[PDB]
Amino acid sequence: ATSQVLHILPKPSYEHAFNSQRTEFVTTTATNQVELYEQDGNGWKHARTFSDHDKIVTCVDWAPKSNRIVTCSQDRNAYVYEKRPDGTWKQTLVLLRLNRAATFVRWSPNEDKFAVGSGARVISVCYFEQENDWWVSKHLKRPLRSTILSLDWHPNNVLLAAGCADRKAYVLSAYVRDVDAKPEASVWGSRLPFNTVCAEYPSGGWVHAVGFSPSGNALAYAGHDSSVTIAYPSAPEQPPRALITVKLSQLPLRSLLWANESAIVAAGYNYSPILLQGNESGWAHTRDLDAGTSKTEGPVSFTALRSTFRNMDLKGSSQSISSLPTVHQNMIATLRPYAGTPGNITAFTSSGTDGRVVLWTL
Amino acid sequence: ETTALVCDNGSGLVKAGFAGDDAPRAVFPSIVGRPRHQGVMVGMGQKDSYVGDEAQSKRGILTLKYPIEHGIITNWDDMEKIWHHTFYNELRVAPEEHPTLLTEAPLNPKANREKMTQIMFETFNVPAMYVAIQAVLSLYASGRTTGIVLDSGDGVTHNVPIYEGYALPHAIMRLDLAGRDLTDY
Amino acid sequence: TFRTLDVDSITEPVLTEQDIFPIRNETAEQVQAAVSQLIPQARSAIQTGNALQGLKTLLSYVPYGNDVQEVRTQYLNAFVDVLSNIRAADIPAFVKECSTEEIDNIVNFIYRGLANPQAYNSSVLLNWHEKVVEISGIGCIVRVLNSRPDL
Amino acid sequence: MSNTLRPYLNAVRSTLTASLALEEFSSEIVERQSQPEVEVGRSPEILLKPLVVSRNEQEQCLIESSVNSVRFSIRIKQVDEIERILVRKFMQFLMGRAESFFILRRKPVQGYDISFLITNYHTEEMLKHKLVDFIIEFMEEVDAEISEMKLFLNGRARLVAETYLSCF
Amino acid sequence: SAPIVLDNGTGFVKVGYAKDNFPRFQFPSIVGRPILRAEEKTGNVQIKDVMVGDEAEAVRSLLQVKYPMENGIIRDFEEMNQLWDYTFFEKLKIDPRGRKILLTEPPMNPVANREKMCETMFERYGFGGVYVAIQAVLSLYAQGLSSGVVVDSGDGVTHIVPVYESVVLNHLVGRLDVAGRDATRYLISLLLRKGYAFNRTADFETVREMKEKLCYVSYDLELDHKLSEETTVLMRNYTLPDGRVIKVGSERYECPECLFQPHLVGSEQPGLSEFIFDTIQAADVDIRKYLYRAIVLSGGSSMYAGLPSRLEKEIKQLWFERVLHGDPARLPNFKVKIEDAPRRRHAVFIGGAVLADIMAQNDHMWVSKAEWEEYGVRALDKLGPRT
Amino acid sequence: PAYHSSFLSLTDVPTTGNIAMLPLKTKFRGPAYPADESQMDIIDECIGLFRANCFFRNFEIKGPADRTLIYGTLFISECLGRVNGLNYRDAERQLNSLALENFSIPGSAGFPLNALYAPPLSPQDAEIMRTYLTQFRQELAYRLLSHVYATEKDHPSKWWTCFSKRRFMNKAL
Amino acid sequence: ASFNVPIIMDNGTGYSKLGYAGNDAPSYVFPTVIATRSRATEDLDFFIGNDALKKASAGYSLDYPIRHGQIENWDHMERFWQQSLFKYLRCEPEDHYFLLTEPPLNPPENRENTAEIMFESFNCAGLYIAVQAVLALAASWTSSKVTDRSLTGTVVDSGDGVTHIIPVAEGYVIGSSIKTMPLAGRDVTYFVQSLLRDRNEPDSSLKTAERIKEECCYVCPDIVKEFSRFDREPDRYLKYASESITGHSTTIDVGFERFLAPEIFFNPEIASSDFLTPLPELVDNVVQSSPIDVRKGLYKNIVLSGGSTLFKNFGNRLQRDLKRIVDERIHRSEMLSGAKSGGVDVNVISHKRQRNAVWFGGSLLAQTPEFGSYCHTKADYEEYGASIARRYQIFGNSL
Ligand SMILES: Nc1ncnc2c1ncn2[C@@H]1O[C@H](COP(=O)(O)OP(=O)(O)OP(=O)(O)O)[C@@H](O)[C@H]1O
Ligand SMILES: Nc1ncnc2c1ncn2[C@@H]1O[C@H](COP(=O)(O)OP(=O)(O)O)[C@@H](O)[C@H]1O
Ligand SMILES: Nc1ncnc2c1ncn2[C@@H]1O[C@H](COP(=O)(O)OP(=O)(O)O)[C@@H](O)[C@H]1O
Ligand SMILES: [Mg+2]
Ligand SMILES: [Mg+2]
Ligand SMILES: [Mg+2]
């Protein structure tokens, strides 16, 4: 493949999100600030910041249809941002009623409701009441046991894949009346009342991420044991047809994105993304998209010479510092789509603790 | 990080600037020239002495005289005036806010260096200062560790051979012939 | 006074290890008998100069649990002896001719053997660890970090 | 040093680089707060099993990991009690300046003499592919220092004995 | 049009109107006189005779700051008059005569302060209405609750008041003389431990922002002493607005500890949790659940990180130690729920805004100008006959 | 640091910008209203208090009279820095020449204390301020010269010129 | 059984005063400075005290281990202690009990380092750490026979590096009222040196400034009136004979410094902007922050301490200022209320042992039989570790 480094953030970024037109993107940093960036010719430049929160901002997600930004942070509060006609953005607090720090947020594919993961044993799902202009949260506390580490919606807009930190993968129905209509019968189930245990699957570690297939009839989750498991549901209260597990020889995976109806791209502490080709019969690692082991008479400038003396003085080597082969320098955060019709993705972006926002061109 | 003034009061020019700058931002001749005419004209606030570029520009009716002679200071009052000019009218930084870094030729008289540090501490109230050697700094700028450095400024020409780290103090040869003598010839 | 005497330990019962990992369906007597049957086969295989086959047979079943300490210690002693009775030059073929789960058990038990050096030989365990990490990769150690505490 | 500590040193290297897959995680019992989870040990569902690396009975490497923090304590050889006193004093001086080290504990865990503690932030900002390099480098250089300092003790004792005795 | 509401807190000033949700303007209650010291004193725009509010806190480098209000009461009143003038004349720039204002006041203030504040508001402004309400009832209004005990901790003084089913127990109102200012002073002392000295006036606001950004409330004392005794993870780096960085260690968890252990600042009064427990226990046996079941934090000083959890754990522990006498049999039969709404800092303002239109459209509920002038100071009894 | 002009308590005193038109006694020409000959005027008290004010490093202003006192202190520092090592007649010549020089005024770019001193309201106010400052510093220099040579004639007393290097408030004309 | 006499250490910023318990005077009062180079190895070529002072230009570079009361470099401190013990004090550490002193408001890390150095490098039988003040209160009372102990007052300990105002009530020290100004004899010495600098005197050595204080400086009521008096009175213009090294009869013409230097205590703005509260006002704040019942005792007995309080008219001026401020407050209350009162008196007390009150108090305290039980025994250190003395006790409450 081929990758282009979009920007070099000065600080680690655990999340990013692009607008529908892919014109400007929002990203988080280490502190309570949330950063905005816009294109400057061939590069990107700073746009504005948000200091509404008080503690470390955890996750940020952009709604492409309505062009809205939500932000859930460690301060147990959620802010929803909508741009004003003049150009500025209007903040709006959402009362999550949580007891611990939020961890992960996602917009529904219809963007009517958004679910919030949390370490307070619960998950908060919020919608908008036009009659009161209010956001109200509902707690999902029946089967949950540990911290929420990831979220994943379903194309039916009702099922919600929750990646818990109790070595068990969770799927729940987030259907709510007055917002969503009745959903069609699904392989996951048909009778879907609010807060019902759709499915439960085990793992060999904390479920860092979960993901439904583009067809919507599967789940893929990765534990902390560097193993990605692809689930194929059969019927309600019926064991899945096949639980394919692929075990790797690298660092544990972090986030999972579905390249197409039969391909999964996932990246973690290995500083690189991977690809999975297969079907119901099985799966296997296909290729290392990060070039693998690439290992990538003249005057000396004043800055270089000063650097050489500083390294010599503070050090005993005065040699090149890292020269790390992989494009990223630290653990990767997440993978999100960039362009293409559903089930047809060729470009997807990624962010990491090094601050690099590296687009990946399949 | 810890910016410090770097004043190299050479015998012909006074190159100055902050630490870490790519090139010095304050270069001007080390000349103090008083007028030598009656000056019946009144007004315009005619000063009693001009230093540096102003002296060079007004040299038509000024008695220019260098305050240093072959690296050795001989006009301490004039040199104090030049230092005041460098600190205030050219760099525009308070002396008591940044440390300074001076240079002097090898084998110079000890009283010269003693009075240099005495003035820069008692008068300008600088926090700290150091008196390096021109050859060592030239070795720094050359990006090497060994070699014999031939330094020849306006005042004096001197060679300080330096091996890896260590500098031999018995092989320092100093010759007074320099740019001023060449100009006189 | 009232600052001490913590109460948070009783009002909210924290999650305990059996809530995380699946419980052992087998009984204590059953696993004890299984190990007591497997070990002498391994010792006999060591005696007849077929240590690779003995280790393969001993690797088929692996016991665990918080009530099987003694039998687990005997199993570990037998495993350590079997592994130390293997020529070094034949290790890479053995490592390459294993499944991922078998290699996971091997690395787990050699690493537990490393924890008690006052009764074992650390050199052979370190050499095996080096070779398995070189061949299989780091995922084995990852699985070790994410294995059951009773293993 | 090396040519001598290959298997033990590489085992420590591999275990440490595998155990450094940290992550930002808040506190599950206190809100709007984040603490190193290895040191508190209140939520067992995020604490990986303790791991030990050894080469001989007097050398151990306790590796305790967690979701965000990793504590790594080692024992170094003390063949004779001279080396015992030297090691204790030297490692005390080493931990006395943990402010400028960022990966040290001011007091080691009991039964040991040093305990590193790599919280998330160190992996967040400081590139961590040479933290392990520093670890192994120290684990060999420390024995080097102990030997050299006992040589220096012998030398100074000889010098003072000669100085005292020559002035009769 | 709509009545105005004013919350003249000790460390901050908030103002707005009825039906509002968030404070329209907030700014420190500071007065800046010009001063020249050993600084650079860039002439940014100009220095006026008396600079107050946002301009004062922005140009604070070149001016000295005096706090008109201390311990919840006004010390010097001319500066506070300048403060009302600023707030009414440029913060809102609407200064009609005859509008209705709803003031605020902590419970056990001296009578003279409130009386002469009302006198100033009448004579110097000519407003046609006035009402002074306790911050606690406004905090109760903020969440719409009716029964329960609410604790308000601010910059000046921390007070707690129990209310059961629309009845304020005036004989059990609390007053703890430890607040954010004492915490800031203890932080300054704890920094003087290491060597840093903050004796200027702007340094007070600097260390206030430092405590805002870094300090946190401990949840387990011994655990944090162990952390600060063996590990260097607690060290934070803070850069002053002047540009200088300092090292902060155990000060982070030792600064707000004075709220729970007032003996650190030389206060004989019991800690926050102990005082809450005594206040709840002194009440009648019937309302004790609803006192325990609904405890609402309010005020800026309650925004300490990890404060609600420590408060709940400590109140449960103290109940266990004081009532059960060590018997753990009946511990799981206790229900305590501390409220931690995100805007508990502006709960007083929200309650005032609600009460502004709760009792509007009927002037015969509060005091008017004519009634004031013809019944003297004693006219100020229609508000409430509190003890 | 509490030392301040005794005329800050004056009432109905005229002013220009934010600088008081305090009375002054002088043989020069200017707008200052002559003061009583038996009193302790602004210039005399400023000269007397300079030797103690130049050592402080924290001054809080209470009114325009304090601004006048600060201006006087700045001029005294400048003169002490200039009068060093001269004669008597030469001292008066040099000080009069420097005082009559077209200096910087509040409201102009070159004024170092533009933050504290307000610009003049009207051009007439600007001109009256011009003449006030000229007269004030002329008389201040005259009084300083009278005081500093109170014992000899051919040399300034080193006790009174040892304050020349003292840089009062680090901000001066 | 019969133990050996305890040893009273003292490590001030400028001077260190060793000695023994029961003695009527310190055995050694020499500056806290160590000479050091940069066929004896460089490990041992170090001199301390007066020997270091004399051997200054012979090839050594002096350095002061203690500044502002807190020790920065540890090699210098440990070498200073070993040189003292094994050269001047002449004692075997393992058979004696030590009474170290160190200024309050120190980091616990410094105390931990001091304890571990003492119990490892030397490993004495026992080590006790006391606060520079306390001993001052102990030495305050002269005819201490059985009963006449004040046990309640204020100690204004002003020394070379830092000054401390510590109130004591019925023995116990009220921590919450402790406040410290970071100005002392050294800062005013630098001020005197700068004053000599501006007048371009022929000699401006720091020792010359110290001697100029020793026989010249005195406190004055106010600065402008003193300047006027100096202008009028011409016999206040002294010329101190210097004789630095070879400048025979190079008299230094002293001037306004004689009253400008001591005024820093009652006007701290001159020294620096780090502090701006005058000493009497700061003492007033300290007394007011104290509990109400002990204010009379705090005001009644004020004890001076340290070598920097020996200025003439220092106590008189301090008492005058404090009395004026307390009268102002009391009268303000009176006209607010409208009733007379008996008022409160102030008696600033100076005694015959002003210079070394801390040492004398330590010596008087160590002789008590109960002192031995309070020391840190070596068994306690070897059992509980090197952090046995880290819990800071006098100022502030732990946990
Ligand atoms: N997140 C936070 N962490 C720590 N302290 C905080 C935080 N937020 C606010 N504070 C403190 O709260 C104070 C502001 O409180 P506020 O001004 O609302 O009380 P107040 O209205 O003055 O009280 P009163 O009505 O009794 O006068 C500030 O001094 C600040 O120190
Ligand atoms: N390009 C040049 N060609 C010839 N002579 C030069 C040139 N540049 C400088 N010089 C001579 O060098 C002298 C300046 O030397 P300088 O670098 O100031 O030495 P220093 O700093 O030690 O005084 C001048 O007198 C000038 O005559
Ligand atoms: N007679 C004196 N008058 C004023 N200051 C003095 C006098 N003698 C000494 N000093 C200064 O006061 C300091 C206080 O003395 P001392 O208490 O021994 O010092 P330290 O505070 O370092 O323990 C001395 O170091 C010295 O700088
Ligand atoms: Mg040169
Ligand atoms: Mg309030
Ligand atoms: Mg002292």
mmCIF file of all heavy atoms in Angstrom, chain A residues 54, chain E residues 7-12 14 72 106 135 154-157 180 208 211-212 299-301 303-304 345, ligand 1:
data_model
loop_
_atom_site.group_PDB
_atom_site.id
_atom_site.type_symbol
_atom_site.label_atom_id
_atom_site.label_comp_id
_atom_site.label_asym_id
_atom_site.label_seq_id
_atom_site.Cartn_x
_atom_site.Cartn_y
_atom_site.Cartn_z
ATOM 1 N N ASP A 54 -13.125 20.081 31.661
ATOM 2 C CA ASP A 54 -12.264 20.372 32.798
ATOM 3 C C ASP A 54 -11.137 19.370 32.974
ATOM 4 O O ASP A 54 -10.033 19.756 33.364
ATOM 5 C CB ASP A 54 -13.096 20.429 34.083
ATOM 6 C CG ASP A 54 -12.647 21.531 35.015
ATOM 7 O OD1 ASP A 54 -11.470 21.938 34.927
ATOM 8 O OD2 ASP A 54 -13.469 21.991 35.834
ATOM 9 N N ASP E 7 -25.497 37.651 42.585
ATOM 10 C CA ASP E 7 -24.878 36.744 43.551
ATOM 11 C C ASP E 7 -23.468 37.259 43.817
ATOM 12 O O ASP E 7 -22.513 36.866 43.141
ATOM 13 C CB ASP E 7 -24.872 35.310 43.041
ATOM 14 C CG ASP E 7 -24.337 34.333 44.066
ATOM 15 O OD1 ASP E 7 -24.512 34.586 45.275
ATOM 16 O OD2 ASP E 7 -23.745 33.309 43.663
ATOM 17 N N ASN E 8 -23.340 38.139 44.807
ATOM 18 C CA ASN E 8 -22.061 38.765 45.142
ATOM 19 C C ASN E 8 -21.248 37.862 46.070
ATOM 20 O O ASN E 8 -21.058 38.123 47.258
ATOM 21 C CB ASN E 8 -22.300 40.165 45.705
ATOM 22 C CG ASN E 8 -23.095 40.167 47.008
ATOM 23 O OD1 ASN E 8 -23.393 39.124 47.587
ATOM 24 N ND2 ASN E 8 -23.444 41.361 47.470
ATOM 25 N N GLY E 9 -20.714 36.795 45.485
ATOM 26 C CA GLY E 9 -19.890 35.871 46.234
ATOM 27 C C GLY E 9 -18.567 36.486 46.653
ATOM 28 O O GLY E 9 -18.143 37.535 46.168
ATOM 29 N N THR E 10 -17.906 35.808 47.593
ATOM 30 C CA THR E 10 -16.665 36.335 48.150
ATOM 31 C C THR E 10 -15.564 36.410 47.101
ATOM 32 O O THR E 10 -14.858 37.420 47.008
ATOM 33 C CB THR E 10 -16.212 35.479 49.329
ATOM 34 O OG1 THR E 10 -17.221 35.491 50.346
ATOM 35 C CG2 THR E 10 -14.914 36.017 49.905
ATOM 36 N N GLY E 11 -15.403 35.360 46.303
ATOM 37 C CA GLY E 11 -14.316 35.323 45.346
ATOM 38 C C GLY E 11 -14.731 35.624 43.923
ATOM 39 O O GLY E 11 -13.882 35.878 43.065
ATOM 40 N N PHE E 12 -16.033 35.609 43.660
ATOM 41 C CA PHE E 12 -16.545 35.822 42.317
ATOM 42 C C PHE E 12 -17.857 36.584 42.397
ATOM 43 O O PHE E 12 -18.512 36.629 43.440
ATOM 44 C CB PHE E 12 -16.753 34.496 41.574
ATOM 45 C CG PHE E 12 -15.523 33.988 40.879
ATOM 46 C CD1 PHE E 12 -14.580 33.245 41.566
ATOM 47 C CD2 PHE E 12 -15.315 34.246 39.536
ATOM 48 C CE1 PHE E 12 -13.450 32.776 40.930
ATOM 49 C CE2 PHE E 12 -14.186 33.777 38.893
ATOM 50 C CZ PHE E 12 -13.253 33.041 39.591
ATOM 51 N N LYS E 14 -21.471 36.937 40.128
ATOM 52 C CA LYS E 14 -22.317 36.441 39.054
ATOM 53 C C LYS E 14 -23.579 37.284 38.991
ATOM 54 O O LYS E 14 -24.090 37.728 40.024
ATOM 55 C CB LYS E 14 -22.680 34.970 39.264
ATOM 56 C CG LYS E 14 -21.543 34.000 39.001
ATOM 57 C CD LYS E 14 -20.658 33.835 40.226
ATOM 58 C CE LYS E 14 -21.417 33.179 41.367
ATOM 59 N NZ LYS E 14 -20.556 32.988 42.566
ATOM 60 N N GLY E 72 -16.983 35.831 53.678
ATOM 61 C CA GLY E 72 -18.380 35.976 53.336
ATOM 62 C C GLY E 72 -18.996 37.315 53.677
ATOM 63 O O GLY E 72 -20.191 37.507 53.418
ATOM 64 N N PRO E 106 -24.899 34.310 52.758
ATOM 65 C CA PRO E 106 -24.746 33.128 53.616
ATOM 66 C C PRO E 106 -25.512 33.293 54.916
ATOM 67 O O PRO E 106 -25.843 34.421 55.311
ATOM 68 C CB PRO E 106 -23.226 33.050 53.852
ATOM 69 C CG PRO E 106 -22.642 34.288 53.249
ATOM 70 C CD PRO E 106 -23.611 34.792 52.242
ATOM 71 N N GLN E 135 -28.016 31.052 50.157
ATOM 72 C CA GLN E 135 -27.504 30.293 49.020
ATOM 73 C C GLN E 135 -27.991 28.850 49.054
ATOM 74 O O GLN E 135 -28.098 28.199 48.008
ATOM 75 C CB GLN E 135 -25.977 30.338 48.990
ATOM 76 C CG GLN E 135 -25.392 31.637 48.460
ATOM 77 C CD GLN E 135 -24.917 32.557 49.561
ATOM 78 O OE1 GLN E 135 -24.697 32.124 50.688
ATOM 79 N NE2 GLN E 135 -24.754 33.834 49.238
ATOM 80 N N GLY E 154 -17.726 27.650 49.066
ATOM 81 C CA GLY E 154 -17.286 28.686 48.173
ATOM 82 C C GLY E 154 -15.886 29.167 48.481
ATOM 83 O O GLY E 154 -15.085 28.481 49.129
ATOM 84 N N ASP E 155 -15.579 30.368 47.996
ATOM 85 C CA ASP E 155 -14.275 30.964 48.259
ATOM 86 C C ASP E 155 -14.194 31.475 49.692
ATOM 87 O O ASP E 155 -13.170 31.302 50.361
ATOM 88 C CB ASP E 155 -14.015 32.085 47.245
ATOM 89 C CG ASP E 155 -12.609 32.677 47.338
ATOM 90 O OD1 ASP E 155 -12.028 32.758 48.438
ATOM 91 O OD2 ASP E 155 -12.083 33.082 46.281
ATOM 92 N N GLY E 156 -15.268 32.083 50.188
ATOM 93 C CA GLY E 156 -15.242 32.715 51.490
ATOM 94 C C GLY E 156 -15.502 31.790 52.661
ATOM 95 O O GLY E 156 -14.671 31.689 53.568
ATOM 96 N N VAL E 157 -16.647 31.109 52.661
ATOM 97 C CA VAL E 157 -17.033 30.266 53.785
ATOM 98 C C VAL E 157 -17.935 29.152 53.275
ATOM 99 O O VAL E 157 -18.669 29.318 52.297
ATOM 100 C CB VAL E 157 -17.724 31.092 54.896
ATOM 101 C CG1 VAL E 157 -19.116 31.526 54.463
ATOM 102 C CG2 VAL E 157 -17.770 30.311 56.197
ATOM 103 N N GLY E 180 -12.281 27.893 50.128
ATOM 104 C CA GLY E 180 -11.235 27.896 49.122
ATOM 105 C C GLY E 180 -10.084 28.828 49.437
ATOM 106 O O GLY E 180 -8.941 28.545 49.070
ATOM 107 N N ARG E 208 -4.072 30.417 42.966
ATOM 108 C CA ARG E 208 -5.462 29.983 42.882
ATOM 109 C C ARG E 208 -5.705 29.188 41.608
ATOM 110 O O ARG E 208 -6.344 28.130 41.639
ATOM 111 C CB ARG E 208 -6.397 31.188 42.949
ATOM 112 C CG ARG E 208 -7.867 30.833 42.797
ATOM 113 C CD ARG E 208 -8.718 32.073 42.595
ATOM 114 N NE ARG E 208 -8.669 32.547 41.218
ATOM 115 C CZ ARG E 208 -9.400 32.051 40.230
ATOM 116 N NH1 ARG E 208 -10.256 31.062 40.432
ATOM 117 N NH2 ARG E 208 -9.270 32.559 39.008
ATOM 118 N N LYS E 211 -4.052 25.729 42.010
ATOM 119 C CA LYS E 211 -4.883 24.796 42.761
ATOM 120 C C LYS E 211 -6.103 24.380 41.951
ATOM 121 O O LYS E 211 -6.575 23.243 42.058
ATOM 122 C CB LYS E 211 -5.295 25.427 44.092
ATOM 123 C CG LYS E 211 -6.490 24.779 44.759
ATOM 124 C CD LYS E 211 -7.143 25.726 45.746
ATOM 125 C CE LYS E 211 -7.946 26.795 45.029
ATOM 126 N NZ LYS E 211 -8.361 27.884 45.954
ATOM 127 N N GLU E 212 -6.623 25.292 41.129
ATOM 128 C CA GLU E 212 -7.715 24.950 40.225
ATOM 129 C C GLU E 212 -7.312 23.830 39.277
ATOM 130 O O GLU E 212 -8.085 22.896 39.039
ATOM 131 C CB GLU E 212 -8.128 26.190 39.434
ATOM 132 C CG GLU E 212 -9.277 25.986 38.462
ATOM 133 C CD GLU E 212 -10.615 25.882 39.154
ATOM 134 O OE1 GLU E 212 -10.758 26.458 40.252
ATOM 135 O OE2 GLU E 212 -11.525 25.233 38.596
ATOM 136 N N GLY E 299 -21.565 24.899 44.991
ATOM 137 C CA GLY E 299 -20.513 25.882 45.119
ATOM 138 C C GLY E 299 -19.283 25.519 44.303
ATOM 139 O O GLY E 299 -19.099 24.384 43.859
ATOM 140 N N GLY E 300 -18.428 26.522 44.096
ATOM 141 C CA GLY E 300 -17.213 26.296 43.334
ATOM 142 C C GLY E 300 -16.224 25.398 44.051
ATOM 143 O O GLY E 300 -15.566 24.561 43.427
ATOM 144 N N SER E 301 -16.103 25.555 45.370
ATOM 145 C CA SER E 301 -15.104 24.813 46.128
ATOM 146 C C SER E 301 -15.405 23.324 46.212
ATOM 147 O O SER E 301 -14.534 22.561 46.643
ATOM 148 C CB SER E 301 -14.977 25.386 47.538
ATOM 149 O OG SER E 301 -14.192 24.537 48.356
ATOM 150 N N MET E 303 -15.919 21.518 43.590
ATOM 151 C CA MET E 303 -15.490 20.963 42.316
ATOM 152 C C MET E 303 -14.174 20.203 42.413
ATOM 153 O O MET E 303 -13.592 19.868 41.376
ATOM 154 C CB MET E 303 -15.365 22.075 41.271
ATOM 155 C CG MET E 303 -16.676 22.501 40.628
ATOM 156 S SD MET E 303 -17.908 21.192 40.515
ATOM 157 C CE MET E 303 -17.150 20.097 39.316
ATOM 158 N N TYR E 304 -13.689 19.936 43.622
ATOM 159 C CA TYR E 304 -12.454 19.181 43.779
ATOM 160 C C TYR E 304 -12.601 17.789 43.179
ATOM 161 O O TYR E 304 -13.628 17.126 43.349
ATOM 162 C CB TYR E 304 -12.083 19.076 45.256
ATOM 163 C CG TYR E 304 -11.337 20.273 45.795
ATOM 164 C CD1 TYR E 304 -11.768 20.924 46.940
ATOM 165 C CD2 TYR E 304 -10.201 20.749 45.160
ATOM 166 C CE1 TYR E 304 -11.091 22.015 47.437
ATOM 167 C CE2 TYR E 304 -9.517 21.840 45.651
ATOM 168 C CZ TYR E 304 -9.967 22.469 46.788
ATOM 169 O OH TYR E 304 -9.288 23.558 47.281
ATOM 170 N N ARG E 345 -21.298 24.428 40.809
ATOM 171 C CA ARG E 345 -20.635 25.708 41.012
ATOM 172 C C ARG E 345 -21.583 26.892 40.884
ATOM 173 O O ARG E 345 -21.496 27.824 41.690
ATOM 174 C CB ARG E 345 -19.482 25.864 40.018
ATOM 175 C CG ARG E 345 -18.874 27.256 39.984
ATOM 176 C CD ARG E 345 -17.476 27.238 39.394
ATOM 177 N NE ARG E 345 -16.788 28.508 39.590
ATOM 178 C CZ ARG E 345 -15.569 28.775 39.144
ATOM 179 N NH1 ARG E 345 -14.869 27.880 38.469
ATOM 180 N NH2 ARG E 345 -15.039 29.971 39.382
HETATM 181 N N1 LIG H 1 -12.409 22.559 39.720
HETATM 182 C C1 LIG H 1 -12.052 23.206 40.855
HETATM 183 N N2 LIG H 1 -11.089 22.718 41.664
HETATM 184 C C2 LIG H 1 -10.725 23.352 42.793
HETATM 185 N N3 LIG H 1 -11.274 24.504 43.212
HETATM 186 C C3 LIG H 1 -12.251 25.103 42.497
HETATM 187 C C4 LIG H 1 -12.706 24.471 41.253
HETATM 188 N N4 LIG H 1 -13.666 25.264 40.747
HETATM 189 C C5 LIG H 1 -13.816 26.311 41.595
HETATM 190 N N5 LIG H 1 -12.973 26.212 42.637
HETATM 191 C C6 LIG H 1 -12.863 27.177 43.753
HETATM 192 O O1 LIG H 1 -14.132 27.777 43.999
HETATM 193 C C7 LIG H 1 -13.981 29.175 44.230
HETATM 194 C C8 LIG H 1 -15.125 29.936 43.576
HETATM 195 O O2 LIG H 1 -16.283 29.790 44.388
HETATM 196 P P1 LIG H 1 -17.477 30.859 44.303
HETATM 197 O O3 LIG H 1 -16.874 32.207 44.002
HETATM 198 O O4 LIG H 1 -18.569 30.319 43.415
HETATM 199 O O5 LIG H 1 -17.991 30.890 45.821
HETATM 200 P P2 LIG H 1 -18.665 32.213 46.426
HETATM 201 O O6 LIG H 1 -19.947 32.475 45.677
HETATM 202 O O7 LIG H 1 -17.607 33.283 46.514
HETATM 203 O O8 LIG H 1 -19.016 31.732 47.919
HETATM 204 P P3 LIG H 1 -19.822 32.692 48.923
HETATM 205 O O9 LIG H 1 -21.197 32.788 48.310
HETATM 206 O O10 LIG H 1 -19.772 31.960 50.241
HETATM 207 O O11 LIG H 1 -19.036 33.980 48.896
HETATM 208 C C9 LIG H 1 -12.635 29.580 43.658
HETATM 209 O O12 LIG H 1 -11.900 30.325 44.632
HETATM 210 C C10 LIG H 1 -11.912 28.287 43.353
HETATM 211 O O13 LIG H 1 -10.720 28.206 44.134
#
